[PDB]
């Protein structure tokens, strides 16, 4: 199961110049395209090896469309400021998210386009790709515009067409890096807090993709009430890592096991502290 997404963010800075526009593209963690308005020469610059093999016409049209997105989102910042009757000295943020999800077979199962204003959902495209969902009375106006122009047809055409086709193309040009499955290297650590209590920590390092399941079990029974579980953080080299700790009494620490499930595993793993 894969996907391809494009994000954007427009942040206004009054008295500090024109609002900043940034745009990025990912395949399912992997940034391969970046645009920054504060760069020296704003262009759609590559961020992955399997995309640099595209010709200059690709980057030329990408930069053209991205510049159009920047100016359009700046006019959107001014427009939404008019909807909400806001001051001209306040900084505001406008975020955008488009993408398409490909199932196990390779055909579209989900596609979406979403807009947020100041960290709050503003305008969403429903799953039927033919209707909109507005969050407030000011978003109803943008909804009526999208219904008047019937842009859901062009949006559905991109999500069902270009998005899926170029997702396949990106997956084939980057098969060695994107369709890989690195299993996590696992080990369990021990940390006393004081006498009669200890902390068992189950580690999973250097795996891909990001999704993983770490579970602690007391005598083969899940313990998901008293477990610390950090959110999956990136290592910095394209891999991910995660740990899960539980507090156990001193002596009963052999009754605890770490059941770790990952895609790259040939089968689920079960760990126990070794000292």
């Amino acid at each position: 199961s894969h996907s391809m997404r494009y994000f954007s963010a427009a942040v206004s800075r009054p008295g500090r110049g024109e609002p900043r526009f940034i745009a990025m593209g990912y395949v399912d963690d992997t940034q391969f395209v970046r645009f920054d308005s504060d760069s020296a020469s704003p262009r759609m610059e590559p961020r992955a090896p399997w995309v640099e093999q595209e010709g200059p016409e690709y980057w030329e049209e990408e930069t053209r469309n991205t510049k159009a997105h920047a100016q359009t989102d700046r006019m959107n910042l001014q427009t939404l400021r008019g909807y909400y009757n806001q001051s001209e000295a306040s900084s505001h943020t406008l975020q955008w998210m488009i993408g398409c999800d490909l199932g196990s077979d390779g055909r579209l199962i989900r596609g979406y386009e979403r807009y947020a204003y100041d960290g709050k959902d503003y305008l969403a495209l429903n799953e039927d790709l033919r209707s909109w969902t507005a969050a407030d009375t000011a978003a109803q106006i943008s909804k009526r515009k999208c219904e008047a122009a019937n842009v859901a047809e062009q949006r559905r055409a991109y999500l069902e067409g270009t998005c899926v086709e170029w997702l396949h193309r990106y997956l084939e040009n980057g098969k060695e890096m994107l369709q890989r499955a690195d299993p996590p290297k696992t080990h369990v650590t021990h940390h006393p807090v004081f006498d009669y209590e200890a902390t068992l920590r189950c580690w999973a390092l250097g795996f891909y993709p990001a999704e993983i399941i770490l579970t602690w079990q007391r005598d083969g029974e899940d313990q998901t009430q008293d477990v610390e579980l950090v959110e999956t953080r990136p290592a910095g080299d394209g891999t991910f890592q995660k740990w899960a700790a539980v507090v156990v009494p001193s002596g009963e620490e052999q009754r605890y096991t770490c059941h770790v499930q990952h895609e790259g595993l040939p089968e689920p793993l079960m760990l126990r502290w070794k000292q």
Binding site: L205, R233, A235
Partner: peptide
Amino acid sequence: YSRHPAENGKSNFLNCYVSGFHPSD
């Protein structure tokens, strides 16, 4: 956190992952 398991003397990468904030400044 560190990129690789920490052992004194051997090179590594110090990482500060800052997530879940708004606005972006």
